Amino acid sequence: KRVISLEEF
Amino acid sequence: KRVISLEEF
Amino acid sequence: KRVISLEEF
Amino acid sequence: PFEIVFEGAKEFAQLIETASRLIDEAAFKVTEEGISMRAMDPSRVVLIDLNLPASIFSKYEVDGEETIGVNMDHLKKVLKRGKAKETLILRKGEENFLEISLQGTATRTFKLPLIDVELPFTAKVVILGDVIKEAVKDASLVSDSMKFIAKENEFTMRAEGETQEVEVKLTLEDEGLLDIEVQEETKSAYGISYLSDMVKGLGKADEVTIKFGNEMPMQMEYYIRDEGRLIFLLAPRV
Amino acid sequence: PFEIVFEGAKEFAQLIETASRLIDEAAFKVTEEGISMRAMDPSRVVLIDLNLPASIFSKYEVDGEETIGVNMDHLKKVLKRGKAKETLILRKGEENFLEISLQGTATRTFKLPLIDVELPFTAKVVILGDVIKEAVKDASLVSDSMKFIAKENEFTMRAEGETQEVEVKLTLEDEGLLDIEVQEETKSAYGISYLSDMVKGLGKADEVTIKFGNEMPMQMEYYIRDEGRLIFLLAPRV
Amino acid sequence: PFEIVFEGAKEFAQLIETASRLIDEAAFKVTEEGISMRAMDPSRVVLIDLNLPASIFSKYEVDGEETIGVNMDHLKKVLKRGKAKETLILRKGEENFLEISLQGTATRTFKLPLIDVELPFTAKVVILGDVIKEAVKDASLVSDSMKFIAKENEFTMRAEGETQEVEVKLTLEDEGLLDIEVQEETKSAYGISYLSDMVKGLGKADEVTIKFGNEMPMQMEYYIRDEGRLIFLLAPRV
């Protein structure tokens, strides 16, 4: 459910 | 013009 | 740009 | 505990999309005979009867009788997902759920909860599907209602507005009237909003039967495959 | 007291749907020659002339001359009902009514009331229907107006906005310029809203003639069947 | 100072219309290798990489390297104007402008200003374009997100809402799974809004590769012609 960002990968 | 119901038939 | 009328031709 | 398989799934969605157009909910009686849907629109002006008998399914495994109720909107939307040549499987286990699967390149299964459930005809006309679809659409341009008039050997639908008027005659000569059978002069008028839903999606090759009585309800009937049938009872105006 | 029959009714609806796109009402002069429509849009910037001569009808029975005026919206909507291969019959009796009938599987007749009625061209270009339909649509992406420029042996439509610009060159080499005939350099600009209505529905195979003068009105002409014609006179910008 | 010619222009508009669907602006690196576009949507949840190598162009004349930035909306709208069999020529002179020309019956040239510029995958699945396009559309009916689950020899996409649920199984038997390669059980969930843009316009014959990791981003890859490629990196949910 919680949409994160690409920056952390 | 006068729309009736199906119940009366 | 300035739209005229047909009447003048 | 049933498993029901219909070929030509897009076709099956169509029939249900008809029934969806006037009612918001519906009961499906599954039995070893076939599937039945019976239902009246919110304002009790139209009555739908769908009969889908075992023969039109490629597999039909019913155990006794039960009664499915479904959100027809959510059913319409799932059934719209079927492709024309794809296979439809309907399934019910102990749990209150309808399993709907479509099979093609891949198989997709959708689970939908079950919800809670709930004439002396003078004239009879047979008519191609295009003629009546066209007349209804023609009539909608001029009025909110259409008149049906049947004298012996000739059949007329007409409508009139303030300014403009429409009339479509057929005698047995006319190319899309297959049959007419009238005991006496018969005249009745019906609302166009309902007629439009009733006839939306009716091919040239579709024999449509209509039974009517002077100021009394119309019965419209056409077949699904050969064995199955859809009948609409429509109350009249004035 | 006339009876006029046109084959290819969908085609007839098309021509009228053009004329409907810029004017709200129109006069139809019926005569034993043919049918005529002449009319100017509300803001007197465009002028339409339709000539439909007797030959393009399969039956043409006129008695003298009269002048029909019709609600073009209600006419557009009735004429849209015709199928492509269906027959159109137009009819007028003593009563102020236009009988329009379409015949196919069944015949449908619609009655519509009658209402009350009411250049030194430098360059001439002939051009396929697709080229100009495309240029107008290309130009609409960047500006509300399009320039037409004709030098000897070369024909350009161009338009410019704040950021973006469009230009379509044709010389006699270019595949969709049939003909060009210019006495002197000719440059004029026309509003795109009107051009879009004028060229909407113009096939690859449609020879369109355009006559223009430096800052003076465009005359656009194309044929209906062989004998009949539609001419649009469009006032220019600045 | 480049001149780049692509056959099948409608095709070229399609690829760009994909890239337009998630980002508002984009950089095009032109080099003697090919054309490159790299870009992230406003919320840095998706990353697009387009590679269009020289071979897929009928003429490819680049002098060194420069970097075009364009309004993707205005580019989308110009590129939509190309017909399917028409030729696309892209051109850049010293001035900050992209010349786009489409050639058919006539040649039209549009000038658009330049603007300012600016993983340890467990599972890998190959899948036909239709299967995934269908699953995404199926899933959107029930939820705003879709789960991807890969065990050895079997591949599942599933989504669940309040009432209704969807699941699409594939094993190597299933007709539209070409290939699957999973090191360990892999489960991740992705938003449907992004997936819909990613898979909108994917034929039956389109091999789509998807690499995913337990709660980590999806990499979706499919080819343009043979040499060119589009890769989408999509961050996951929770």
Residue numbers in the entry:
A (entry chain B), B (entry chain B), C (entry chain B): 1256 to 1264
D (entry chain A), E (entry chain A), F (entry chain A): 2 to 119, 128 to 247
Authors' description from the paper:
To better characterize the role of cPIP, we co-crystallized PCNA from P. abyssi with a 12 amino-acid peptide mimicking the DP2 cPIP and solved its structure at 2.7 Å resolution. In contrast to the structure of iPIP, which differs from other structures of PIP-boxes, cPIP shares the same overall fold as those described in the literature. Indeed, the side chains of L1199 and L1201 in iPIP and the side chains of I1259 and L1261 in cPIP are accommodated similarly in the PCNA-binding pocket, suggesting that the binding of iPIP and cPIP to PCNA are mutually exclusive. Deleting cPIP in the MBP–iPIP-ΔcPIP fusion (DP2:1196–1253) strongly impaired binding to PCNA and abrogated binding to the DNA primase, showing that cPIP is a dual PCNA/primase-binding peptide.
The bacterial sliding clamp is referred to as the β clamp, whereas the eukaryotic and archaeal sliding clamp protein is called the proliferative cell nuclear antigen (PCNA). Clamps are constructed from either two (β) or three monomers (PCNA) to yield a ring composed of six domains, which share similar protein folds. We have shown that PolD uses two distinct PIP-boxes for molecular recognition of PCNA, which are located in the C-terminal region of their DP2 subunit.
